[PDB]
Design a protein around this ligand. Sequence first.
Ligand SMILES: O=C(NO)c1cc2c(Cl)cccc2s1
Ligand SMILES: O=C(NO)c1cc2c(Cl)cccc2s1
Ligand SMILES: O=C(NO)c1cc2c(Cl)cccc2s1
Ligand SMILES: O=C(NO)c1cc2c(Cl)cccc2s1
Ligand SMILES: O=C(NO)c1cc2c(Cl)cccc2s1
Ligand SMILES: O=C(NO)c1cc2c(Cl)cccc2s1
Ligand SMILES: O=C(NO)c1cc2c(Cl)cccc2s1
Ligand SMILES: O=C(NO)c1cc2c(Cl)cccc2s1
Ligand SMILES: [K+]
Ligand SMILES: [K+]
Ligand SMILES: [K+]
Ligand SMILES: [K+]
Ligand SMILES: [K+]
Ligand SMILES: [K+]
Ligand SMILES: [K+]
Ligand SMILES: [K+]
Ligand SMILES: [Zn+2]
Ligand SMILES: [Zn+2]
Ligand SMILES: [Zn+2]
Ligand SMILES: [Zn+2]
Lengths: 408, 397, 399, 408
Amino acid sequence: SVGIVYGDQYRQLCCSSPKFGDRYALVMDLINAYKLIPELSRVPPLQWDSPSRMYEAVTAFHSTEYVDALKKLQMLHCELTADDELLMDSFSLNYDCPGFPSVFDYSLAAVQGSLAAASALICRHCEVVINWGGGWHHAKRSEASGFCYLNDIVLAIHRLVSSTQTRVLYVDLDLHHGDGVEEAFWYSPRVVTFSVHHASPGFFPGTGTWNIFLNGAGRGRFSAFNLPLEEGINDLDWSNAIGPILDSLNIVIQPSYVVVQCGADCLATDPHRIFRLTNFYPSLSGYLYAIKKILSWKVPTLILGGGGYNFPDTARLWTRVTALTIEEVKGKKMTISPEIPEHSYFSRYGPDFELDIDYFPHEDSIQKHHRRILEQLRNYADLNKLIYDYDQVYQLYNLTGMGSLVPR
Amino acid sequence: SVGIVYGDQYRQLCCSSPKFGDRYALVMDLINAYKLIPELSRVPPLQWDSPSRMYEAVTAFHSTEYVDALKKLQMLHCEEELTADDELLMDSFSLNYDCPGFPSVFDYSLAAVQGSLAAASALICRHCEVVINWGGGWHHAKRSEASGFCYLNDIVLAIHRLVSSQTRVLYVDLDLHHGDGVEEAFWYSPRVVTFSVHHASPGFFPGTGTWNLPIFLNGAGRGRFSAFNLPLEEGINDLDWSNAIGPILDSLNIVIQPSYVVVQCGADCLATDPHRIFRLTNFYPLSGYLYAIKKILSWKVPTLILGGGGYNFPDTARLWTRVTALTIEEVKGKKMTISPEIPEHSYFSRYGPDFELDIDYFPDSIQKHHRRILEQLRNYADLNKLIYDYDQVYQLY
Amino acid sequence: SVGIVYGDQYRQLCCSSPKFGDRYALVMDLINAYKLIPELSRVPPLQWDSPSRMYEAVTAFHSTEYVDALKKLQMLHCEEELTADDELLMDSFSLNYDCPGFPSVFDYSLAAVQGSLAAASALICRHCEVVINWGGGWHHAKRSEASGFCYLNDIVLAIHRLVSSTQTRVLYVDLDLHHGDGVEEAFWYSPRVVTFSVHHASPGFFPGTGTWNLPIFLNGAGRGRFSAFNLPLEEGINDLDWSNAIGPILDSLNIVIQPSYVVVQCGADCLATDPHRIFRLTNFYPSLSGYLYAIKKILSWKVPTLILGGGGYNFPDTARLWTRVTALTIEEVKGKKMTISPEIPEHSYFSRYGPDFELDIDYFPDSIQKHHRRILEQLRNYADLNKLIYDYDQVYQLY
Amino acid sequence: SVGIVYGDQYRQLCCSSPKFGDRYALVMDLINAYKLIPELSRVPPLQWDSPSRMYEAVTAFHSTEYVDALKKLQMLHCEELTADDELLMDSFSLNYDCPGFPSVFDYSLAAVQGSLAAASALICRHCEVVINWGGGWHHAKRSEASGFCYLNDIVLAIHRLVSSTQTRVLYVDLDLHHGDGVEEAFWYSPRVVTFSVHHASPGFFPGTGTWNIFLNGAGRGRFSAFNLPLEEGINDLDWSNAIGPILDSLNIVIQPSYVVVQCGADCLATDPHRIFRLTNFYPLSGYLYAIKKILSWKVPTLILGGGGYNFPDTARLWTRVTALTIEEVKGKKMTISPEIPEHSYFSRYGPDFELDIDYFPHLDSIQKHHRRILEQLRNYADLNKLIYDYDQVYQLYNLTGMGSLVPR
Ligand SMILES: O=C(NO)c1cc2c(Cl)cccc2s1
Ligand SMILES: O=C(NO)c1cc2c(Cl)cccc2s1
Ligand SMILES: O=C(NO)c1cc2c(Cl)cccc2s1
Ligand SMILES: O=C(NO)c1cc2c(Cl)cccc2s1
Ligand SMILES: O=C(NO)c1cc2c(Cl)cccc2s1
Ligand SMILES: O=C(NO)c1cc2c(Cl)cccc2s1
Ligand SMILES: O=C(NO)c1cc2c(Cl)cccc2s1
Ligand SMILES: O=C(NO)c1cc2c(Cl)cccc2s1
Ligand SMILES: [K+]
Ligand SMILES: [K+]
Ligand SMILES: [K+]
Ligand SMILES: [K+]
Ligand SMILES: [K+]
Ligand SMILES: [K+]
Ligand SMILES: [K+]
Ligand SMILES: [K+]
Ligand SMILES: [Zn+2]
Ligand SMILES: [Zn+2]
Ligand SMILES: [Zn+2]
Ligand SMILES: [Zn+2]
């Protein structure tokens, strides 16, 4: 069963932020317009029996002082002293992450959605669950960052990993380094994090690059993987870059769950304009390539949104991801019309009104990164007494003539 | 409120240089040890949405080829020896000798820029009345040249952002060395008045900010008379230094009426700086620095305070800690009581031998310059059609 | 209206190269000798408001560093020999061997750009239905490389301006003896510009492309897949066989693509009397000239069309052909019958047209079936990929 | 007496073109606003006693067929063209850069009327200097419109001057562009020496006035056409240093009976061309420096307009030029307020409302051009049997220590 997080209130809340406007509505209604919704099991967002149980859920990662401040920030904007200002600043509730009347509700909602998704996986109601309202990988224990206020991903992972030798693989496909999730599990071997991203001087947030690579500490050493890529990269190269690494991670780690953040700001048409990925499906979408690969493992999977600042193109991508998940899991062909279907956001898909993003692909190796990452994987396996099947990893990279990159 | 620039990454990068080592960490930890952090609005350093946007920000002052060179210099020091052609490229930008490469030289340099641009932004959006960046203040760097361990000129870029938001900016450079990079950048610009007080003497870095019968150059084009300089002989103490620049600061404020003040507060004027040229102190009963900062903060113009030179790291920290307390006092009107003894913290042992907050120190030409500076100011004011109570300006002397 | 690009300075620049000498002057003077010029609208070469706007126009295709190198090369040839470092620099852009520098290499190259951009503009604003630029058509030049006497690709820049007006689609038809590789490569990834080159190809023959590469034909990539068309032909082909080879392809490209504009490179090196001595086409207008057959066919479509020159190293015979192409264009567009005397009229260059002084050039005059099925399948694939409606047997009927 | 060309109908006509809008009105109204008009002798535009006399005057330079065409073009826009009228217009470049419009012939004629009347005031010695800010259309050819020039008022004016009664005219073209139309008209004539300083670079209009060696006239006109092409970016001082000694040398050797100066304002830093960086500053403006120099010769002088596409800044410069001419010719101090005076075009000088243009000035030498130019001047002097005063020219260049550039 493929689940998808949705609700009337959930939709209203996910659409109440100044930065992301009605993006979530575009996504879900495009998915709706393509008649995908009947194929999916609706996963209702989690609700609690009291403020204290809510508080307990959220402070499983975030500090009590941080959650209180975020509460007050909401309350304040719903009606600031010199000390109110300093309190909010001490949590970076400013600049990139300012208050607005529904800031706490907005932020809580993504947590409700992703915790519910996690719960649906744990009780085996869904093989895969999608939450396009979640995926806020930058929030820290006591700090808002990059439009992220509560880290729904950390909390969903914490629920999975503490369910019941249970390991979680986190795969971050967003343009940006998933610093908040990596940091939360820096000392934990059982959550292996892997972020592919752009990194360069001055580029947000600054981590996931050379320092050598830091890769976890204590019992968490070797458990935080990173692949920084240069700008301009297309679907095929991005696919080749991360494909073998994902399979090798799956072979060695043998995750009980996978969590995938699928931020769409790698699209060629994103306002960032750094990567040149597409949503094309025949020249194949780097995104769809990765998602299909992850789904072929038959490991219970949570698929989350994230970045993506071209709202219609983000909808175009995530609708195809959704159709693909249905195909890969239900074994059911999802034929998607090249023309955007009639619905109330139809006008936002102009001037072409077509499903493919309006981009024309056209045209540096990272083999040392592969070699480095495989050695880290070797070290992770040794530290945690896992089997490092050199045979299967070799044979994998050998499919491209790069078996030599694999350490014994 | 009073803002101050810091962050975890920011701290690591500011401490990544060979020359200034862990100085920034001593300063911030001492500020933290004295409990000043809760009084202050943390200002996060600027980050950008793409490499093009970063280049756009930095090449507002610096040439693109220089920035390319600086970035290549980093990559080279992260893999190596340079070839003859690379050495030649680096030399043509003075990325050599006093300004060598090191593994994180571009990231390190850019950090100061990130810090002081956010500081400027916080002032512009009026989130803070004053912002402190003890990681910034690199006043020697030129359009296409590293100089005086400055690789990128965070001050020029901060000031540019301020004038680009009719805005006039007053730049006050208290460092022991002439603030030539900033002065050169606005040589043709009357909207940014620069004023540096400094030591100058034959062969002393960087050589400018003094007689050039020779005369003082002071700006060109519409920027004529807009660059002010007061060179001072070695040995000057707090009182004489204060009296030297006091009436000038006050007259500049009266006539210019700046929308923003940017202060470079390099601590190499301290009697205990290894330069051993001036004899300023951090004393607060009076410190030249504390006197100047308070005079400037009395104007209640939104103000950026930056670091700079300072090669005795604990004494620099002792100085900038007092400056930070003073700012908290003059802006918020709230009494700050700093213990005379250094509090226990990570770096307590660096504060030997006595572990006091005061530094371990016991303590006509100026009139000529005053008359000259006063005629230049009148000239500037004339040329720019400004209102000047000359009946007032003169009595400051 | 039929436009033609000319001007006194333009003429001087187009005649400043050591390779093509005064060919352009011969062409325009023959056209003038035959009283065609009063029938045509003068299209003046484009000029720019500043160095920056010129650079912006040219670097819409070419890299800045290449344009810089080309301008440096001109200045270096204007003074007294190059240094070792300059030599290296020039070599990295192939500003050597076939494409050396000379005192006005950048102005000369730029002139053809100025003319073909002015031509494109005359079409877009609909001042002219067809525009001729016999100073243009330099199809071998690449983004950062000179090739085959081509320094700046005027055709690519003209086409870019055409598609950048206002789904505008452009059909490029390259009739030169040589494969139009620079144009094809520029639009390799664009479905909006369909390129089609008929040419000689054989081992060792310049530039080497436009043919089998069991090999098979490359034909575009990305969303540009199947959008590059090529028909390579064996040496010795005559007017009639060439016409029949190209005729059905041209007609079906127009049917399927329905272009908004047609850009035609009319390189005259396929002439029997070109010193290449490869193809045996004529300028005959009763067999009938392959060139005139193709142009009449393209003109019959009533699409705003850009006609450019290109190769052609027998200068009087290039003049003879393009004089006839020009007259045909005037006839086909204005409906006005043009009567050209079979003998060369007196004019300043009359001596060059010996020994017989006639307008006709002095000449006594399966594989393509597989190429046709191949090309038809590519066209089917292009239409499929691009959601184009067309028949199936109506397309097939033309064969 | 300093004359200035103006009238009510003249103003309306000069303001009737699509390209130059109401520029002429801004100029004249700013001059009026600074109270300069009472200092100036109004020179009324020339009118004729019959169409045949008008036609005779204009066809002293232009072909009958071009003027016929230009007349027809006006008639047409005062009523679609037939295919052949179109071909007729195209043959005269009455298109693109020089389209027809309702008053195109009246507009073009007006400038001729202004510059001919101006030449006549100089000839009969009514004025020692005459200004025509409606004239200076230096691009127009015998049978061809060019660079929005339709009729060449300058050629017609010069012709009137040079026919009055050893009489030589110096033509000085300060426009950003090469004065090709004037140069070409007098290419074979020694009694009109032309000098143009301008930008020239690949693709820049009109293309001439640069290396071809320099062409410099033919037949009896050999060596009589001078050109100084300059690279982009030049300031007041360098431009001043570039043409000052050449101008003084031209005056010494040629001994003009009249000077005609085209003072096109598109060398201003604030011109949308953005190529040179001249100002109108006056305590120094290149323009003011050149005009002051030319006036110091005490030779009867015609001052004309031309290019200039920042209309307020063109008015700002020509107003200053106008005051300077009054000052220099009458000996009468012309104090001009730094604030723009109240007048109906006051709002066009925002946001500063001051007379100085809104600009902050902030190996590349041409000494070989001086040497080349002085050599040409020597060649001219010999061809025409004139005194080449070596010593005076030497002493002139020796002021700047460059006497060695002067040939014997
Ligand atoms: O998408 C993002 N993270 O996953 C972010 C975007 C931005 C922007 Cl556009 C500005 C500043 C910070 C961030 S984080
Ligand atoms: O066995 C299955 N369907 O009949 C599948 C299970 C899964 C899981 Cl658990 C994850 C991803 C894809 C599939 S298909
Ligand atoms: O702190 C400084 N400038 O503000 C500088 C110190 C030095 C030294 Cl110690 C040697 C060489 C250059 C500089 S710049
Ligand atoms: O108004 C104030 N406190 O109540 C102050 C404002 C400022 C400014 Cl804008 C700059 C520097 C000091 C102060 S105190
Ligand atoms: O006409 C041509 N291309 O369209 C060319 C002729 C030649 C020759 Cl003759 C030698 C080398 C390259 C080329 S390209
Ligand atoms: O519509 C027309 N005449 O009335 C014509 C248009 C064209 C075009 Cl667009 C190209 C070639 C010939 C003609 S005739
Ligand atoms: O001012 C001019 N000549 O003296 C000219 C300007 C232009 C422009 Cl902006 C375009 C095309 C021709 C000309 S001539
Ligand atoms: O003599 C004069 N004023 O008293 C002057 C005559 C001239 C002439 Cl003819 C031309 C330019 C300036 C002056 S000043
Ligand atoms: K990522
Ligand atoms: K981990
Ligand atoms: K200083
Ligand atoms: K200044
Ligand atoms: K061809
Ligand atoms: K194509
Ligand atoms: K000129
Ligand atoms: K002449
Ligand atoms: Zn992102
Ligand atoms: Zn210093
Ligand atoms: Zn050819
Ligand atoms: Zn001009």
